[PDB]
Each structure stands twice: as structure tokens, then as C-alpha cells.
Amino acid sequence: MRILVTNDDGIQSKGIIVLAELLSEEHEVFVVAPDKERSATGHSITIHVPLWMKKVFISERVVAYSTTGTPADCVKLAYNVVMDKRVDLIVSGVNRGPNMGMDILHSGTVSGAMEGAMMNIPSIAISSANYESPDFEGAARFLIDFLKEFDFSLLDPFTMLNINVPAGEIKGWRFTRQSRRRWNDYFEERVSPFGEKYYWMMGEVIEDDDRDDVDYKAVREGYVSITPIHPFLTNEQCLKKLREVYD
Amino acid sequence: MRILVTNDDGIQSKGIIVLAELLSEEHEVFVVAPDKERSATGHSITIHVPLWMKKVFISERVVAYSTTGTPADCVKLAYNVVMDKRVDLIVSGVNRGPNMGMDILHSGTVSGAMEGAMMNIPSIAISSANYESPDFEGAARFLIDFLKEFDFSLLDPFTMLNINVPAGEIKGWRFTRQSRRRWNDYFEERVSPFGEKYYWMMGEVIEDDDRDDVDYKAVREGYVSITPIHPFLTNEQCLKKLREVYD
Ligand SMILES: [Ca+2]
Ligand SMILES: [Ca+2]
């Protein structure tokens, strides 16, 4: 299987290296990731200026390239220029920290995998749900096992898998829905040497989902959270109501 | 989009001119076709003798060249010496007459596109389903409209689309599978002036497909037939059984 590995922390990140090396023992792995920190870049793409790539070494077992673009740019470039449109699976990660709730909208890790979903290529965004003490190997090992037990034909079109792995013990797998986890974010105001004020974004997490099958609850219980998501944001319930009211 | 256009009827065929002209209205078109009739040449290529090319005129925006080779040779030449290995799409046609069932194996039109598939370049073979009232403009116009509605990421690697446009009115299009339409060939015997007999190949068509989603049935109904085909001929079903018995 020809696998494309990418991430949003940079090609030199420990999370992507372990993932690539472990996947290289059984598959043909191609790594195309950002040449710098791309966390919180969401699904941004580069259209105003050109993109550049650089061949880098990360293992004699894998073909690697860094690009001046975003995670989504990396997937487009890998697909069209590095892998000759021959990609069997796309894995974006392993990210240091969780990617759950509404945070996935600005997640670079998720965007990489989503670009794959948009092309109907089986894709997975994988994150170690513990920023402080991440377990890249455990997440990678879990993935290798998942690839042997999961049947990707069950994946509907334009659908990818957003995966969050507990850092401690993995007590099992659980298919979940995206939660509404978000933040009470504010700003820390400060003053620069030249007398101009500046702001630092800060925040406290909000976990107020009443539903029992959401992503963070599963992870909280030591269970890997596997959420099938697609690039469609329509609020059907609301749409139906707006119509039965006007038109 | 850098598009390569070829055929099996010769660069002077009305079928290829109409097609190249329309595609140029919004695409960088290059035409590399045979300098002579090449219908029924299948996937033959020129390896025993040299290949020659000749600059030809068709449009002020379209770069054209005829060659002494087959449709397949044309694609190899076009790609390596005319388009600097930069081809986004290959379209072969528009052919005068259908290309469905087993007949696609000896079709020069199909082979032009199949060579592109072998080189892993998105390719399309397009034919007007009526030999006697062909409709080159209709077939070409359908393709232009189809391109605006087709997602090339869904066209697997080494795969091409074999398209047959019915003559007359198009009710719509369908993604079909290759049928087993074929011919019961035979020969009419005749004698030359010098007393030696010769044979003229003739034949009656055989249409005995029980499946409803095959190419010719869609065409008969007034629908464009679109079949995704590739250069892989293994009979998996037969192979499976052979391995079960000779394990
Ligand atoms: Ca990150
Ligand atoms: Ca022909």
C-alpha cells in the first residue's frame, strides 16, 4: 500500500517520524509535510504565490519532502507531483495534542486528512490526546493495528476518519461523533518596548456536551475516538425550519 | 489544462479537428495524430523502424503535428518531445463509429487513450456511435460539458474513460461496464485477375449480454456510455478457482 504521511507540526516533528518509520516496515511510505510550524492553520491553502518542495532525509525506507505550504498544500502536492496520483491512504499526524470538538475546524492535522477526503482518498487524521505527555509510538502502533482490522469500504464518499488516541492505556476503540468542545478564549494584554500594546490569545476549555457518544468522553474513558467526518457544514435541522417558515 | 489530442483516423479527420478546436476555447491544446488511416490497428507501436513527425496547421492556438506512427506512438511522441512530459489530459477521437465490447481491443482510438492510461495520465477515448450518421460536433460538445461535471480524482491510476456518444439526441449519460459485444467474423472468397484467391473480412454482430449496465445497451437507449477501463486483463474469478484446485 502506498501511504502518504503528513502533519502540521513540521517534517522534523517526532510525531510524524515515528509514524512514518513504523508504517515503512510494511508499506511504501511517502512523507510530504510543512517545513515549519503549521499548527492552527486550519484548511488554508496557497494560491497567491508559488509553492516549493525540498527533498529531505528521514529514513532510507521512505521518500520525504518538505514544502513551503500548509498541510492541505502538502496533500495536493504529494498527490499531483510526488506520488503520481497513486495514493492508497493518507495519514496526517501523529499530532501532539487532541483534535476534538470545534477545534477541528482550525486543525492543520485534520485539514491534511480532509484534503484527502475531498478527493475520495481514504484518509485519517491521528492525534495523541495529551499535549503534555504525548505517546507517539502508542498512537502509531494503534494505527498499524487499525489498518489490519478496519474495512475502508464502509467509508462513505468524501469521508475521512478523525482519530484521537488516549496517552495512557488504550482500553478499546469507539466510533464517535464530533463534540461541541470549544474554548472560553480571551486575551492577555501587554506592552512592547516601543510603547505599543499587543495581545496573547488564551483560553480555558469548555466541555459541556450532554451526549454520551462524543469524542472527548471516549478518550476520557481511555478509548480511542474514531469520528467519521466530511466537508459538509449544512445545519439540516435549521434549514428545514427556515423553509417551513418563509418560502 | 495542457491537453493532448490524438485519434486513429488521421490528423485531417473532421472528428479530431472539431474536438481540438473546441477544447482550445479554454485549454492549452496539442494535437499529435497519425498521417494516415489507422483504424483497427489496436495497440500496435513502432519499434523496428524510426518514427517521423511533421508540423501541421489546424488552429492559430493549437500546436499540431502528424506522425508516421500509430495512435499509441503518437502519445509517446507527444509526451516526450512535444509537451515536455507535462500532460494533464489525453483525449483520443472523436472516432467515426462505435468502440464497445471486445472490439475495443483492436480499436486504434481506444489504444491512443489506453497508452495514456499505461503512462498513468488521465485519458479519454471518445467515439460517435454511428458510423454512417456521425456527429463529431455533438460528441465534442458533450465532452466539453462533461468535463465541467467530472471529478478526475475519481478516475483511478492507469485508468481511462471509453466514451460512446449516440448520434442524434442525448438523453443523458451513464457509467457503464464493458459488454461482451463481439463479432462472428467470416470471409467472402474471391479470385484475383491472376487466378489467386483472396479474402474479405466480414461479420455479424453478437449482442447477448444479459447485464443491463453494459455499454451498448446505454447507447441504444440514447444515453452516452462511459466505461472506466484499464490495461489489466487478469480474469480474477478464473485465477481464484485455479488456485483453489491447484493449491
Ligand atoms: Ca500540531
Ligand atoms: Ca476510426
Curated annotation (Swiss-Prot), chains A, B:
Top EC class, one word: hydrolase
Summary of activators and inhibitors of this protein: Inhibited by vanadate and tungstate.
Pfam families reported for this sequence: SurE
Cofactor(s) it depends on: Mg(2+)
InterPro entries: SurE (IPR030048), SurE-like_Pase/nucleotidase (IPR002828), SurE-like_sf (IPR036523)
Keywords of the record: Cytoplasm, Hydrolase, Magnesium, Metal-binding, Nucleotide-binding
Domain of life: Bacteria
Cellular compartments annotated: Cytoplasm
Mutation effect (D8N): Loss of activity
UniProt cofactor note: Binds 1 Mg(2+) ion per subunit. In contrast to other surE homologs, is essentially inactive with other divalent cations.
Keyword Metal-binding: yes
ATP-binding is among the record's keywords: no
GO molecular function: 3'-nucleotidase activity; 5'-nucleotidase activity; exopolyphosphatase activity; metal ion binding; nucleotide binding
EC number(s) from the headed UniProt entry: 3.1.3.5
pH dependence as annotated: Optimum pH is 5.5-6.2.
Residues the entry annotates as binding Mg(2+): D8, D9, S39, N95
PANTHER family, per the entry: 5'-NUCLEOTIDASE SURE (PTHR30457), 5'_3'-NUCLEOTIDASE SURE (PTHR30457:SF12)
Membership in a protein family: Belongs to the SurE nucleotidase family.
Name of the protein described by the UniProt record: 5'-nucleotidase SurE
Organism for this UniProt entry: Thermotoga maritima (strain ATCC 43589 / DSM 3109 / JCM 10099 / NBRC 100826 / MSB8)
Gene for this chain: surE
